[PDB]
């Protein structure tokens, strides 16, 4: 899902750019950037809802799925051997030769998890004015504008991958700090004429376990797949318009059933009851920025009478 | 931290080159080089102060932290897929096409240690006149000028990475002889249009142990992270000004507590008295 949505099915509206972007129109000045949502390649995501499993509440434990391994493969590499067609020719001084194939910046990411991918916002110039409809940007989530810290790393420009086709890949990158129930792999290759490179195979498989031997436990019951496969550009003839190209990605996830420990004290539903009948209070800030809680100390055992009762890192 | 400092937060002073360099202005003659500190990419460093641990002075030994492993990752590769914008176009004869993306010389180094990175000074022509303020050069540390031996290897042009954003990466390289409590990894890729290449992954991790199975013991109590991630250039439109680009680096250090032998005879404090 990179630009052109799949809805206008007829191959006459524009020649059916489904699978491609719509165009690219450079900025008109330093400050004027309006990237026109059907130009931006975005993240693809899907959620397979698995059934319910056993519960053993008589003594706290619970069964849930567990993505053990994955075979993935980008389908459709050979289709880039279509060297007829109305693209920029290889010999432009006579407009003859070969209609140049797909080349350019490539970006291959996929991710298999038990919960939606956590994303982090980075950008080139933060003065870009993205449309405020049909796309999710850093302004949509942090209701204020974009600041200079959004050009390097702002720990407040975080998101999830709930929607599909709305998070452009040039703004939202997989979060390294957050993703715990998600294994994501990726690679980027810049340039302007970098030849694409792909390898597909029926045999080799990825393992999604971690150093404890667990692998993504499907929370709720869903299994979340995310991907983006940008293969380059396509330079048309009249001007040098530069539609993107993206190929589908096939997933094959092998999962099993694991016994875990039920985290939540389901009796806490009475708390939910107590949370429903009790009013919604405004109160005075006791959590956050202007918190009014001076100090909290927890006493557990019986330690001998200490000297200076607060002695820690000395610097 | 490559050039433009983060202080003028408004995106109107220049378009907010935070994350980029300010420009590049070639020498005017063979001898005239003044690289204008906000042009030079520099080293990034940080120090996480860990707490104090046990001491067992009744029989000489001591507990201290130990960086066992690290997961690092350069964040923000896909942002270089911003191919709109006011950069040099791919078809300059008509000024049309694609605003060329970030390309060029790349330099990725990181380092996890128990003490600040030891650096060594090398340069291209030693007749370069770096500013004597806001940056640390070989003249700032060896109070004399720069000599020809600074073009190859001078065992006296050594430093540490105490400051942050002040040691340019074109002068100060990680010292191979010195660094003992520091594991540093790096790679450089020259050229003028070399396409960037990055790979990120949630899974694979580096091990910071050595042939004795120790790994960086955090001296004092701090843990020192250092990095530089130069991804290429950016060629503007009016002239061919060539701002740098750098992406942040995420560290995740796994450490544990090790019993070591207390080196210093703390009774030597009386010597301090003496």
């Amino acid at each position, epitope marked *: 899902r990179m630009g052109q949505p799949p809805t206008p099915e007829s191959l006459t509206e*524009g020649g059916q750019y489904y699978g491609w972007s719509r165009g690219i129109n450079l900025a008109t000045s330093d400050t004027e950037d309006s990237p026109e949502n059907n130009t931006l390649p975005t993240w693809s995501m899907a959620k397979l809802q698995l059934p319910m499993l056993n519960e053993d509440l008589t003594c706290d434990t619970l069964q849930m799925w567990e993505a053990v391994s994955v075979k993935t493969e980008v389908v459709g590499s050979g289709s880039l051997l279509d060297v007829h067609g109305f693209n920029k020719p290889t010999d432009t001084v006579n407009t003859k030769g070969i209609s140049t194939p797909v080349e350019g910046s490539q970006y291959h990411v996929f991710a298999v998890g038990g919960e939606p991918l956590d994303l982090q916002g980075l950008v080139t110039d933060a003065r870009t004015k993205y449309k405020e409809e049909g796309v999710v940007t850093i302004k949509t989530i942090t209701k204020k504008d974009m600041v200079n810290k959004d050009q390097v790393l702002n720990p407040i420009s975080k998101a999830k991958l709930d929607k599909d086709g709305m998070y452009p890949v040039e703004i939202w990158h997989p979060d390294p700090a957050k993703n715990e129930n998600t294994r994501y792999f990726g690679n980027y290759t810049g340039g302007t004429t970098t030849p694409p490179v792909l390898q597909f195979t029926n045999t080799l498989t990825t393992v999604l376990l971690d150093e404890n031997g667990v692998g993504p436990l499907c929370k709720g019951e869903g299994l979340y797949l995310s991907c983006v496969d940008i293969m380059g550009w396509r330079v048309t003839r009249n001007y040098d318009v530069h539609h993107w190209r993206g190929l589908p990605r096939y997933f094959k996830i092998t999962l099993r059933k694991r016994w875990v420990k039920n985290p939540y004290p389901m009796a806490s539903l009475i708390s939910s009851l107590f949370n429903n009948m009790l009013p919604q209070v405004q109160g005075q800030p006791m959590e956050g920025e202007n918190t009014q809680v001076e100090e909290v100390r927890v006493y557990d055992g019986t330690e001998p009478v200490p000297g200076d009762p607060d002695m820690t890192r000395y610097v | 931290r490559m050039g433009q400092p983060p202080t003028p937060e408004s995106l109107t002073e220049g378009g907010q080159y935070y994350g980029w360099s300010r420009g590049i202005n070639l020498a005017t003659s063979d001898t005239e080089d003044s690289p204008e500190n906000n042009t030079l990419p520099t080293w990034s460093m940080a120090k996480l102060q860990l707490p104090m641990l046990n001491e067992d002075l009744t029989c000489d030994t001591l507990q201290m932290w130990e960086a066992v492993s690290v997961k690092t990752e350069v964040v923000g590769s896909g942002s270089l897929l911003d191919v709109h914008g006011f950069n040099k176009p791919t078809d300059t004869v008509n000024t049309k096409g694609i605003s060329t993306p970030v390309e060029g010389s790349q330099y990725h180094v990181f380092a996890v240690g128990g003490e600040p990175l030891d650096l060594q000074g090398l340069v291209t022509d030693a007749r370069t006149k770096y500013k004597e303020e806001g940056v640390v050069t070989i003249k700032t540390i060896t109070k004399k000028d720069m000599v020809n031996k600074d073009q190859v290897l001078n065992p006296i042009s050594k430093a540490k990475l105490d400051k942050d954003g002040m040691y340019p990466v074109e002068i100060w390289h990680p010292d191979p002889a010195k660094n003992e409590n520091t594991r540093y990894f790096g790679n450089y890729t020259g050229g003028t249009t070399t396409p960037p290449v990055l790979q990120f992954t949630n899974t694979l991790t580096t091990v910071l142990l050595d042939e004795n199975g120790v790994g960086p013991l955090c001296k004092g109590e701090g843990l020192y992270l250092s990095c530089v991630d130069i991804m290429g250039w950016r060629v503007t439109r009016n002239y061919d000004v060539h701002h740098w680009r750098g992406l942040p680096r995420y560290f995740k250090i796994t450490l544990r507590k090790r019993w070591v032998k207390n080196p210093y005879p703390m009774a030597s404090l009386i010597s301090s008295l003496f």
Partner: antibody, heavy 99, light 98 residues
Framework: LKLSCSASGFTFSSYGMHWIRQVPGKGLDWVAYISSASDTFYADAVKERFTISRDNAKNTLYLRLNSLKSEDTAIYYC????????????????WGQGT | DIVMTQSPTSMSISVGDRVTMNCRASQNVYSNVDWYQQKTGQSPKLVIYKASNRYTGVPDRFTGSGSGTYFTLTITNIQTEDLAVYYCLQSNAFPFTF
């Protein structure tokens, strides 16, 4: 209040169409633009009032007028860009007749 | 918005003579300037597209030149069918202005 510009002889949905109005003594004045991938660009003095649209499979532009029409009156032409691109700037040579 | 100012507001000239009309833009438009001819009662015909080329069917007396902030349209030997108004249009950013 709702204009109409029927076109024939080409593939309508592959070209960008401008609306330009001319007051008979004040010269020409650009009004609006819609491209192949329909995304509307208006003039500064007419932003909130007009709405330019196109309806593919019927080959017609629709410049829905101010819905107020206080001080805007002129000869309204439509213009088609020269090439079938998604490039926004294409020097439209095929003007309409006027209305 | 970019404002285009033309120096000859109204020029009286005969047939066989040379005329040159210039245009100045507030900001920079690289090479995106068109030259339109309108005879009274007709839709404006395109004459010189992109400030340096002659549209098909336009004779060789018309010439478009310039780039950046100063553009010009020149006619070496006027014809009787060249008695029309002439506008210059920047198509380099939105909104377009004549």
């Amino acid at each position: 209040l709702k204009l109409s510009c029927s076109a024939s002889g080409f593939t309508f949905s592959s070209y960008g169409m401008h609306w330009i109005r001319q007051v008979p003594g004040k010269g020409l004045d650009w009004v609006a633009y819609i491209s192949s991938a329909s995304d509307t660009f208006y003039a500064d003095a007419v932003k909130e009032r007009f709405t330019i649209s196109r309806d593919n499979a019927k080959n017609t532009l629709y410049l829905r007028l101010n819905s107020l029409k206080s001080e805007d009156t002129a000869i309204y032409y439509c213009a088609r860009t020269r090439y079938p691109t998604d490039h926004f700037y294409d020097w439209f040579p095929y003007w309409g007749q006027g209305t | 918005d970019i404002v285009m100012t033309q120096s000859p507001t109204s020029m009286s000239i005969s047939v066989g003579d040379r005329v040159t009309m210039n245009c100045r833009a507030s900001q920079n438009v690289y090479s995106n300037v068109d030259w339109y001819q309108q005879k009274t009662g007709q839709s404006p015909k395109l004459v010189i597209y992109k400030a340096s080329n002659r549209y098909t069917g336009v004779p060789d007396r018309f010439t478009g030149s310039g780039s950046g902030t100063y553009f010009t349209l020149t006619i070496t030997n006027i014809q009787t069918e060249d008695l029309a108004v002439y506008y210059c249009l920047q198509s380099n950013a939105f909104p377009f202005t004549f």
